[PDB]
């Protein structure tokens, strides 16, 4: 029912402006639209800045000559309804004229949602609008918001910078919070998308109004602390008032140091949010736009006095609120305060300038040049307003503004892109304690065009960084797999795999094939070396020495028997059988020596033949001698003495043919086998049935030999030598019958073979040659 106050300045062209002079209405007061208290930087410096900027423009003959600029500043109160009311007041002149002077353009407001609300109304009347701090990502769609321009970039770059910051310090389990509205929602969406792409897990997401009460902030803080101590970092893409409410809640709950909140341009370097709550915000990292101070604004501003300022309707209330005084006789006196107001009070003390101030000034020049450019095209030679540009067209002004390009207050260049945005860069600020009860914001980094550079010795002042926000500790030691419960990728539990399994993938282990073992770091199953060499092994080599002794037993006996042909004992029996048995014993000893060798193909070529040929040939002499002894009348048609030799030759030929057939039935080759996972051995292939068959023939021959010896035992002949031989045959049969079953169950096949063959050869040789040797000696 009562109109608000407006700050107006006369001129030929009138430009509107919406500034947040007062705080927004609190809950239980939004319906009446009752604003709060005045503001220092956001409300009262910007009004004076616009007034002085227009005054300076009016004194510039090069820019818009012979034209005067007026203005109307109104209060938006950081609220959508109040700003909508003021915009309706702006457009009421044109609305009535359709059925004072019209507004050609509007500067502001400063928040994204309020800017959208104002733009929706403004675009129907063709009024270009330029913002200076509304950096929402969805305001760049010219299909919906056509008459909107801004001298600042969108918040997509802010989201990218925040993602880079969290990536650099290895934050992987970070909580998130934003504020109601276009700005917070869009920025949090972008941050969530980029974090998901880069592999960062968010514990939970929360939203809250900056107008909420204490209970809401207390509940929010309790929810945030429910995730402690895992999520030690909170990404707060919210406004300054939300951060201040969080700090007040933290003080009320007695929490300090438990969180590291990372903010955005809403809380950039403002001392408003950390006044009286510095201890709750130490160590917080924030990001701000890059904008240096303006000096002539300070020169003009620091000399203003309440009794001589007749342009600002909100200045006496400002003076009283800031200095906590009351002006004695002034018209706008507030009697709430006391102690009156001194005449030596000055505005220089405790002065801090708005951090976006230059941006605002740019938003006032960007419009002006636009008009200038328009005046250079509609009326080329004329100076001043003309009939060709009366009234100013909204579409022509918009198309002239979209083409503008000039130099800013900081020396940079201002020019809009296809979406009506302007480039910019960012600074990374750190809030910390410098002295004793002294806190300040310290510039620690920069971000520009995708490049981030920060100094890490200024943050934390050491290399002991705050414990990184991780849901699970990295426990992959090269033998341990991580597994997921399906809730969050950053949360996992790690368990070992099998000892023979090597870690092929970071999520699973793979087992090696037979004959291969995992390496030191469980990456690569190289082939296990095969151990086959046994020449230097103690057990076989010593046996060879025994065989070597047997070699001497072959050499001495043969030499003595050869040179003793004249002896009747040697001439008593045929020398052919003795030579045959000596050759058989020698070949058996040679096979025993050759058994211990590398499993080459040539070695296994004769190993199968030698194992069976020597016992068969050597014991053929025994059966030949028994047949010759039985051929006599006492032993008993086959009276031929030489028939013994041909029978032995036939037997040897039959044995050789059987051996050759067995060899042809299966060719031998080196075969590698793996009896155990850690045991691999290389031996030439030899089937058990292949070995058994020659043994059966020799056993049958020995059994036939024993029958002949038993019948001939009683017959005395050649110094009772017929009583002998039988003992050797019995011992040979006993040792063979003992060897047959132990061979299958033995774990050292070749060792048992060589020992058995050597023992049989030695026993036969000795037990059959000792009596003749003694007789010769």
């Amino acid at each position, epitope marked *: *029912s*009562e*109109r608000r*106050v407006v700050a107006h300045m006369p001129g030929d062209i009138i430009i509107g402006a919406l500034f947040s002079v007062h705080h927004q209405p609190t809950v239980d007061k939004v319906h009446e639209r009752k604003c709060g208290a005045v503001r220092e930087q956001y409300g009262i410096q910007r009004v004076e800045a616009m007034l002085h900027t227009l005054e300076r423009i009016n004194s510039d003959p090069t820019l818009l000559p012979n034209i005067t600029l007026g203005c109307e500043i109104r209060d938006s109160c950081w609220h959508s309804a109040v700003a909508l009311e003021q915009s309706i007041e702006f457009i009421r002149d044109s609305l009535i004229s359709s059925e004072k002077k019209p507004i050609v353009g509007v500067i502001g407001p400063g928040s994204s949602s309020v800017a959208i609300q104002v733009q929706n109304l403004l675009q129907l009347f063709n009024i270009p609008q330029i913002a200076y701090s509304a950096t929402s990502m969805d305001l760049s769609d010219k299909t919906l918001f056509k008459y909107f321009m801004r001298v600042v970039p969108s918040d997509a770059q802010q989201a990218r910078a925040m993602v880079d910051i969290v990536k650099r310090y290895n934050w992987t389990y970070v909580s998130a919070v934003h504020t109601e509205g276009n700005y917070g929602e869009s920025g949090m969406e972008a941050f969530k998308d980029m974090s998901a792409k880069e592999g960062i897990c968010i514990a939970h997401s929360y939203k809250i109004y900056s107008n909420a009460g204490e209970q809401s902030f207390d509940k929010l803080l309790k929810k945030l602390t429910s995730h402690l101590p895992k999520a030690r970092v909170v990404a707060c893409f919210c406004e300054g008032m939300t951060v201040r409410g969080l700090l007040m809640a933290m003080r009320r709950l007695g929490l300090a140091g438990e969180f590291l909140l990372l903010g955005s341009d809403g809380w950039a370097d403002r001392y408003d949010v950390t006044d009286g709550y510095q201890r709750e915000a130490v160590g917080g990292i924030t990001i701000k736009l890059q904008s240096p101070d303006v000096k002539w604004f300070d020169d003009y501003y620091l000399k203003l006095r309440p*009794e001589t*300022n*007749h342009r600002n*309707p909100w200045f006496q209330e400002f003076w009283q609120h800031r200095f906590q005084c009351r*002006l*004695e*006789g*002034f*018209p*706008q*006196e*507030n*009697s709430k305060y006391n102690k009156t107001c001194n005449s030596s009070l000055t505005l220089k003390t405790h002065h801090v300038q708005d951090s976006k101030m230059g941006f605002v000034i740019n938003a006032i020049y960007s419009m002006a040049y636009g008009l200038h450019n328009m005046q250079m095209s509609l009326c080329p030679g004329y100076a001043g307003l003309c009939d060709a540009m009366k009234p100013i067209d909204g579409r022509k002004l918009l198309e002239s503004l979209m083409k503008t390009n000039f130099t800013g207050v900081s020396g940079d260049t201002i020019l809009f892109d296809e979406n009506g945005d302007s480039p910019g860069r960012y600074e990374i600020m750190n809030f910390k304690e410098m002295g004793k009860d002294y806190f300040d914001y310290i510039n620690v980094g920069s971000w520009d065009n995708g490049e981030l550079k920060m100094d890490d010795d200024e943050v934390w002042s050491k290399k002991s960084n705050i414990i990184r926000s991780v849901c699970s500790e990295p426990c992959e030691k090269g033998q341990i797999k991580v597994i997921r419960k399906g809730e969050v990728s950053c949360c996992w539990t790690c368990t070992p795999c099998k000892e023979n399994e090597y870690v092929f993938d970071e999520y699973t282990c793979k087992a090696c094939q037979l004959g291969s073992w995992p390496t030191d770091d469980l990456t690569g199953c190289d082939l296990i070396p095969v151990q086959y060499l046994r020449w230097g092994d103690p057990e076989p080599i010593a046996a060879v020495v025994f065989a070597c002794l047997g070699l001497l037993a072959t050499l001495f006996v043969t030499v003595v028997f050869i040179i003793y042909r004249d002896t009747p004992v040697v001439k008593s029996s045929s020398r052919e059988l003795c030579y045959i048995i000596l050759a058989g014993i020698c070949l058996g000893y040679l096979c025993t020596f050759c058994l211990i060798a590398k499993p080459k193909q040539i070695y296994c070529y004769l190993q199968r033949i030698g194992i069976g040929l020597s016992p068969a040939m050597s014991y053929s002499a025994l059966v030949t001698k028994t047949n010759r002894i039985a051929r006599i009348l006492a032993g008993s048609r086959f009276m031929s003495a030489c028939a013994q030799l041909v029978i032995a030759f036939i037997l040897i030929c039959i044995q050789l043919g059987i051996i050759v057939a067995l060899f042809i039935m299966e060719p031998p080759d080196i075969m590698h086998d793996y009896p155990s996972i850690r045991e691999v051995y290389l031996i030439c292939n030899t089937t058990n049935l292949g070995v058994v068959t020659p043994l059966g023939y020799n056993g049958l021959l020995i059994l036939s030999c024993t029958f002949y010896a038993f019948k001939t035992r009683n017959v005395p002949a050649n110094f009772n030598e017929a009583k002998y031989i039988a003992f050797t045959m019995y011992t040979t049969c006993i040792i063979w019958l003992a060897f047959v079953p132990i061979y299958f169950g033995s774990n050292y096949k070749i060792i048992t073979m060589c020992f058995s063959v050597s023992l049989s050869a030695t026993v036969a040789l000795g037990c059959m040659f000792v009596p003749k040797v003694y007789i010769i000696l």
Partner: nanobody
Amino acid sequence: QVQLVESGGGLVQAGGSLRLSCAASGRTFTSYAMGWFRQAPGKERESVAAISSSGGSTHYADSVKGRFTISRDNSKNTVYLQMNSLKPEDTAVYYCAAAMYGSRWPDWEYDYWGQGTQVTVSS
């Protein structure tokens, strides 16, 4: 913009009491301090009383101290002046003025002015 109208003046006997009303047409009335002026023949227009925008602060001249009373009503947008124990020397024309952007009283910049009304005293 506001338009100020005057009422309550006329002719009174000595020792009487009067109430003068100044009514402002137009909104934004609560953001304007108010003041009263009087002018008599052979003299110059001199202020008698003033009140701040929200009330609670009243200033009076040394001549009319203890006799005049200035009051406001923002619900109906009307400012009242009460004169008690009037004297024959107060016969003059009275004006009501609205001020903003001022200094310590009586150093005010009055944006708007009223019509004024004659007050006469008979002994």
